[PDB]
Ligand binder design. Structure first.
Ligand SMILES: *Cc1c(COP(=O)(O)O)cnc(C)c1O
Ligand SMILES: *Cc1c(COP(=O)(O)O)cnc(C)c1O
Ligand SMILES: O=C(c1ccccc1)C1CCNCC1
Ligand SMILES: O=C(c1ccccc1)C1CCNCC1
Lengths: 429, 429
């Protein structure tokens, strides 16, 4: 297929994310290669190189086509593509589980592999529900979260998405009815924690778990909050006997400046979800971790088992590339790398603050955000970014980036420069 | 690097397996160290032994493991582009696969939504159905109807249409959506069943978005077969009462039952279809949900204006590329004759089991063979028995069953069936 043929097939037959068939104002761009921090895209019939400022939605932390990851995949492919995890185990699964148990917050000792973040969230909920049934308290059935959140697109995951402003707002009448605390503020305010506790207190006997994105809320608005709130959540959950679940599917593996965002508060949840960057952006894979206490209580219960088991559970190919990706991350001074990225984003985005349509500029590790006073029009933003050699994907009123960790300072500068120019265009027609 | 002994230690301490416990499983997982063609290399008492993958690693490995054409397709794509985000970009693997799938599926299915797993593809199908009727101004049409004995995955909406006993709804009382269940569909065709189905559906039509079933073969709910004419009746009933029809072909697709898709046995097209397990030839997790032009535009024209779903790894280039190769490999051979020979080999090999004391039925459909016993099959006994005979089997409940790779020779099918007969011989003593 030529690029024009791809476009024709795509228009006729392919659903894209959060889209319609045949009613999108701006058509998809054909991507034909990816290498390191760069994509080759087709524009007006010609190949152009642009920076993947989005890391392909958080995934490409080491860039595309990294030699260590490529070879880990081809090495595993030579030996064993996949076997069923029912009654069999294998080296990639064990090596990855060992790595994950070692580097996640203390106490997370068991690992359930699945194929996507949304499924890993459903597994986390299932763990929490089965835990309390194992305790003989089946009334502990509901989840609590704060507003502004996002946890995936399957129907249980949707139930803890922000109900008034979240992307799943139209489904509230058919979703499970969960408990929502107000939006968590950026700056630390003890009164917010006090109110959260008071609200949790009156629902405690029906709550299985609190589920939150720690430090950074992604798809709900790229909002940051003070890590001290996570400390308060841990304390509150401990005292009222409610499990604490951290969704680190976006925040994991160095992105926020710590290995996991939980680490900013030195807090360990009872259950944790990871994904997006787990395989370094090669393949779909996710994992749900829980404490030995949660596992044992589930295993000692009436069920005697966690009733979940995806067909491709612990896929050897995905696990092998994940092992290589994590080892690559840990074998380098990733902390210094991310601090340098954050400095580069901060310095590059600073002039956006003075722009007329810009309401806030904020950076947290290798995440840079320009918040605008109006929704960003992709028809204007997308060519403006491409003209400057950068692939950006704004959403709502946000021009934001999460670059690969391998980006040089010059590349971060090119990215922040494109972001600023997109923001400038927002405020001038 | 890990020895098989170290793998067992890590596994027992840190890894969840499908529908299992931590630290309480009677039969420890067996270490798999390689897979090629129809064969797995497993560790038994410290020794590596090659055994037949009679399960095709849960329906997935239809061309066997490490097939040169599929290995090649993967490595070829890996050199050009591992992954890019599907939000605003498209690519050749996604287009080639979409074009293939719309061409070979039942008539009328011309749009494709890619996701990462079967369970997610089922949730997408449900969401399509519900959003369809919202698009027609009938939001009351929000329940699903199915027959008993079904299985559709492990996420919470998927669980709601699983057989109440199979999916242990006992444990999940009003956690799950309450759906409408018709009685178990019989093996042989009885028009009275369809008439009763219709009468039940008629009572609920104003609140039903869709009927969802596995066509011809019910997999994880009991490996039961039913006459394809029932699907003809469902299509008619759904058309007359304005309820959508969804076929879940995640286990039945790509030739497994003797037709390219099980629906083709009845010559019926559903409004929405799910595929998954064998889509990638068993290399990587991938699934897809297809729908008609009517379904797609009714969704796209509705007030909501977009299908709000979009997995991070949607339409992953590596998974799509190996899928293209797998599908083309299937289509480029006389697959119909291959399956017929496989079916004949299963029939001949399993006939001996009919006369066994513990055996209540023996049945074959395409490349699927089942021995149904009168009591649970003991894994502690069955698994070394099969391994002694060079065959990996994974019995479930009272069923000794197989779905071998399409590449299995007559000699290999003889080996597989003889292991099945002997497992079925040990149960009844
Ligand atoms: C992306 C994401 C998910 C869902 O992951 P998918 O792979 O898209 O199913 C869940 N939670 C958070 C916080 C995420 O960023
Ligand atoms: C296996 C299966 C599913 C679920 O697929 P996963 O990849 O395990 O989520 C759904 N429906 C049917 C009919 C299946 O056989
Ligand atoms: O990671 C995401 C993201 C994060 C922040 C802002 C917008 C989308 C996407 C959320 C929707 N599914 C694909 C990934
Ligand atoms: O396909 C399956 C199956 C099929 C028939 C009998 C038992 C399990 C499994 C069902 C549970 N998830 C992994 C696949």
């Amino acid at each position: 297929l030529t690029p024009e043929q791809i476009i024709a097939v795509d228009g006729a037959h392919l659903w894209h994310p959060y889209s319609s068939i045949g009613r999108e104002a701006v058509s998809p761009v054909v991507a034909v290669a990816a290498h390191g921090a760069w994509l080759t895209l087709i524009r007006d019939g010609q190949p152009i190189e642009v920076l993947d400022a989005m890391s392909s939605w958080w995934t490409a932390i080491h860039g595309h086509g990294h030699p260590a990851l490529d070879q880990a995949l081809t090495t595993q492919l030579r030996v064993m593509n996949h076997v069923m995890f029912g009654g069999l185990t294998h080296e990639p699964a064990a090596r990855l589980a060992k790595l994950l148990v070692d580097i996640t917050p203390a106490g997370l000792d068991t690992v359930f592999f699945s194929d996507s973040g949304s499924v890993s969230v459903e597994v986390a909920a299932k763990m929490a529900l089965q835990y309390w049934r194992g305790r003989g308290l089946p009334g502990k059935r509901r989840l609590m979260t704060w507003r502004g959140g996002y946890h995936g697109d399957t129907f249980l995951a949707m139930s803890i998405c922000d109900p008034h402003g979240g992307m799943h707002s139209l489904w509230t009448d058919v979703l499970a009815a969960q408990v929502f605390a107000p939006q968590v503020p950026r700056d630390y305010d003890p009164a917010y924690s006090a109110a959260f506790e008071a609200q949790l207190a009156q629902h405690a006997g029906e709550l299985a778990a609190v589920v939150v994105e720690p430090v950074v809320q992604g798809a709900g608005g790229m909002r940051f909050h003070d890590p001290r709130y996570l400390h308060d959540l841990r304390d509150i959950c401990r005292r009222y006997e409610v499990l604490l679940i951290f969704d680190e599917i976006a925040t994991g593996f160095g992105r926020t400046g710590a290995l996991f965002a939980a680490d900013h508060a030195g807090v360990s949840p009872d259950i944790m979800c990871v994904g997006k960057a787990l395989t370094g952006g090669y393949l779909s894979l996710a994992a749900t971790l829980c404490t030995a206490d949660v596992a044992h209580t589930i295993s000692a219960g009436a069920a005697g088992a966690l009733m979940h088991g995806p067909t491709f559970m612990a896929n050897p190919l995905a696990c092998a590339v994940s092992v290589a990706s994590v080892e690559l991350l840990l074998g380098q001074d990733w902390r210094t790398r991310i601090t340098e990225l954050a400095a580069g984003l901060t310095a590059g985005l600073d002039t956006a603050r003075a722009l007329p349509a810009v309401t806030d500029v904020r950076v947290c590790g290798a995440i840079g955000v320009i918040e605008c006073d109006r929704p960003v029009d992709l028809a204007v933003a997308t060519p403006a970014a491409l003209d400057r050699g950068v692939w950006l994907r704004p959403f709502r009123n946000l021009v934001y980036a999460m670059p690969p960790y391998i980006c040089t300072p010059a590349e971060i500068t090119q990215i922040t420069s494109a972001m600023v120019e997109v923001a400038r265009l927002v405020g001038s027609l």
